[PDB]
Amino acid sequence: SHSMRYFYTSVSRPGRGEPRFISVGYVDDTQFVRFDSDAASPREEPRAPWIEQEGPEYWDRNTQIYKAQAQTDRESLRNLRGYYNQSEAGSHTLQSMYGCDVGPDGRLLRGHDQYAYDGKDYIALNEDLRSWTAADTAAQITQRKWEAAREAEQRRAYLEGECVEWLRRYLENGKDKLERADPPKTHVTHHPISDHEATLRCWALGFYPAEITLTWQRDGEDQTQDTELVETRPAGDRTFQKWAAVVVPSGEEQRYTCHVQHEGLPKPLTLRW
Amino acid sequence: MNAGVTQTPKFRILKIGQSMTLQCTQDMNHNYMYWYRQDPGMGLKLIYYSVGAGITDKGEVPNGYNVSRSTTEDFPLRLELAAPSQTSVYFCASRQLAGFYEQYFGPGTRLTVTEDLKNVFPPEVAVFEPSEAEISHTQKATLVCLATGFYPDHVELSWWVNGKEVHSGVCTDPQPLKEQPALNDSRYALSSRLRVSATFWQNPRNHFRCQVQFYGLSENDEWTQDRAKPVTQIVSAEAWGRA
Amino acid sequence: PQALSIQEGENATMNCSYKTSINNLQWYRQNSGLVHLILIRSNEREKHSGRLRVTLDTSKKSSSLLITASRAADTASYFCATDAGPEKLVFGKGTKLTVNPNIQNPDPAVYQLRDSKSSDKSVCLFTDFDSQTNVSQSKDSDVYITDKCVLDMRSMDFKSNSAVAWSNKSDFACANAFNNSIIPEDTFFPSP
């Protein structure tokens, strides 16, 4: 199963120019393109090895789509400021995320088209792709307008066909890097916190995609509410990391195992100290 | 009164080297505005466009012209130093958005550039009465209006029956004829017909008028020729019904 | 220049083509200010609205517009526009469509009409011919002959064709005015 997603961010900065617009595009957890209106010569640019091959028409067409989009977001931002009765002096943020999730057959499982204003839900296209969820009374203004113009029907074309077709192209380009999971390497560390307790930390490193489960067990049952987890974090070279830690009685470290669940594993690893 | 794009002036004559401003306004709150030129029988060519107030960019044939967009409502086009190649019909248009949106057009400004205003002549207008043979053969009666000798071809011909403008039973030629088809500067002629029932034409209290609005020189234009100044004027001809 | 002539009631099909990869194609009409007619998107093969049906074939870079049951007010030039980037349209060459009336009781005639003021001036009017008759331009450049024009007497539900000819030549007269055209042999020529 796979997905392609575009993420758009416009940020107003009154008195210091026109809004900044940045976009990034992802296939699953791999970023492959960017656009930043504040660059020297703003244009779409490659960010993964397998997209570089694309010709100048690719880059030109997309670059023109982003510049056009950015200009409409300047008007949307002014509209939004008005709906919420806000001042002209404040910086505000409009974010947008859209794209397609496909299953094993390669056809659409789920379409996405959603928006936030100042970091909170504004409006989202529902999974039937025929109706919207407005977040508050301001957003119902947009909803009424978009219902009247038949926005959802118009959006379905890209989300069902074109989105899906590009995703397939890109899976072809990327091959292993995109289609074969890179399993978690691992380690277990141990650190006494006193003469009667220690920390055991389970480490999961250089993995891809980001989805993973790390679980501490004692004698078999999970150690649910006494585990510290850190957010999954990017390694900096397209892989991910996580750790989970539990504090245990000294001399009992033998009772504890760390179960690691990731798509790149033939079977759930079981680690010990 | 409807929403749409409006343009002024309708018609303009310029001497080579003169300058001009074409105005375009719309009241649909559209952010995207466009200027095109169209030579008769040809296609539109984009001169300049604007995605919003304070923003303009060049189209396919920008040379010779400039624009500005200080408000959403107006998009003025400036013609800097008129040359004969700039004789054309100029169309303003607007739309709501980028992508899957159609454009709304203004009515057009018809511009003639000329080396010398002495080429400009108002029309003479004559009304020709129905023949008795047509009335006997068909029980209908066709009047013909002829407007002749005018240059440039900037006229509007209208028929008035007892003081009120009529459209039913009228056909006016789409295109003028050139009186001297070999000359670039030829004067023109235009015909229209108005057909009524014989009984209508046979009523001598029915009053028929062909009126031609000619768009010519301004008070502003200098005239040092001998003949009458060919200013914007209405020239008309009339007939009464006949028992 | 592409041109198409039909009779009222018939269907009209017009075609256009374009050169680049596109996202949409819009048909417009112009007679008398363009007015838009119908938009089709590059993922669509057919769309219709009312009397109009448009099709699009991106392999052929071509589109057709079908007007069902043509009327007199369909007479116009028809053009296509396609995107050239998100913000701009490029327009093509038109097709000039002429929708002719169906003259059910042709009564071809040529009449002489005198000037309201100086009756020595006159014009020749060829009228009431059916839409199959074509009026030719004059051989001589001092004889003026208009093209054909359709007028509609709406209250009488009656339409008719005509053309007007005039000249200052002393040779000119209504019997020879339209000699350059092929006119019906039973055209009525009343005595001057």
Binding site: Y6, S23, G25, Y58, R61, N62, I65, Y66, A68, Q69, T72, E75, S76, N79, L80, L94, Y98, Y115, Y117, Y122, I123, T142, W146, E151, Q154, R155, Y158, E162, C163, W166 | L97, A98, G99, F100 | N23, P86
Partner: peptide
């Protein structure tokens, strides 16, 4: 590739 599709909120 991003969508060729434009709107206002």
């Amino acid at each position: 590739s991003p969508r060729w599709y434009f709107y206002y909120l």
